[model samples]
Target: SMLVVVTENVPPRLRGRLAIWLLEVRAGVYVGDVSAKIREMIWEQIAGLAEEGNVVMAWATNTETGFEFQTFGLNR
Candidate 1:
């Protein structure tokens, strides 16, 4: 699945971690095509590290909704 991760005020450690797995197209923005398991693991990593910050991940899915997204912490 193709996934996109957007971050706001994320820590350097977390950004580095995400950059290791996905391509950093822009600052705090990540994009990748990975399996469901890998996606969950990546989300787990961010959810754990992004405490004061916030993150959102959206991935390709079936017909109905087109995609699914998950949010971490709070963002405006």
Candidate 2:
């Protein structure tokens, strides 16, 4: 399972887009138990559709931190 947060200047429809793979726990926030393959596909969707928006994706990993994240877009 992992958490995905989308915020700032993102498209409204992106929420619907993500809902296909994850559940919306709050506005701009989604959670799901998905595989690396699905996560990569979701990342691709965000990159393709988010435009000027910002995105943060966090997921469990076998590392010292136990989890990791990736960020996209520029913030004001």
Candidate 3:
């Protein structure tokens, strides 16, 4: 499973793109189960379409944290 959060001046088209893979639980939050390939693809969309908006993508993993993440745009 994975969770993606977008914030600060996000584009509507970016939101729509995320909806195609993950369920939108809130205005800029989404969650879903998907393969690494798909998750990476979604991240690509975020990188390409999110523009100036900030994005964080977290996914389940078999590590000490039991999860991992990637970020795009500015950090808060």
Candidate 4:
């Protein structure tokens, strides 16, 4: 199973925190395994920052459905 969370414009500080919990495979790209709680916690931080950007997330699950979530601001 694979779990993924794709986020952007997450504030430089938050980005660094995410890097601590995950691996930075590329610029603004991170990968790692995370529980629902942890993921939500990170999301809360991003929301608190009130930054502008997009965020996409996914995870491995059953029930014949692809698990994923996405959100972004208007325009750029």
Candidate 5:
């Protein structure tokens, strides 16, 4: 499963793009199940649309903890 957390400071436009891949959990948290390839593709789109603030992603596989990440927009 994938969990995405985007900064509330992120542009609304970018947030919309992130939603294309993830299901929102709350204000800034999201979740989804994605293949490695799909994850890569979503990252590509995120990188392209995120022009302000930051975004993060976390994922897990069964009992194994996966990852948590953050990327700041260039506009920052």
Candidate 6:
């Protein structure tokens, strides 16, 4: 399984936290292969701490296309 994250103007600390659980391309984006609980835990923090920014997460369907995505916050 794989995951992709788009971090839009997220706060520094929030982005910093991502580095622990995922890898980034230095383009304000992150990705990883994590367990369901782990990702949910990550998303939980994003929901709680990712204020003033928008974030998007895409999860691979155990096809890259076979997936559902979750969105939060706001960004232009």
TM-score for every candidate vs. truth? Answer: 0.91, 0.85, 0.86, 0.70, 0.66, 0.85
lDDT of candidate 6 over 2-76, digit per residue (tens): 778888877888888888889997677999999888888888878877788999888877455698789888663
Better of 3 and 4 by lDDT: 3
Error of 1 at 13 (Å): 0.8
Best by lDDT: 1
Task: For model 5, give the 10-residue run with minimal summed lDDT.
Answer: 61-70
lDDT tens readout by residue for model 4, 1-76: 3545566666677677777667778766777877777777766765665267665556666657756554544333
Segments of candidate 1 deviating more than 4 angstroms: none
**Cα RMSD to native, each candidate?**
1.3, 1.7, 1.6, 2.5, 3.1, 2.1
Q: What is the lDDT of residue 62 in candidate 3?
A: 78
- Taking all chains together, the TM-score of candidate 2 against the true structure is 0.85
**lDDT of predicted model 5:** 0.67
Task: Give the per-residue lDDT digits (tens) of candidate 3, residues 1-76.
Answer: 6555554567899888888988888778888989889987888888888777888888899789999887787554
Q: Once model 3 is optimally superposed onto the true structure by TM-score, how far is the C-alpha of residue 47 displaced, in angstroms?
A: 0.8
Minimum summed lDDT over a 10-residue window in model 4 is located at 67-76
Candidates' C-alpha lDDT: 0.89, 0.81, 0.80, 0.64, 0.67, 0.83
- What tens digits encode model 2's per-residue C-alpha lDDT throughout 6-27? 5557887877888998988778
Clashes of 5: 0
Off by over 4 Å in 2: none
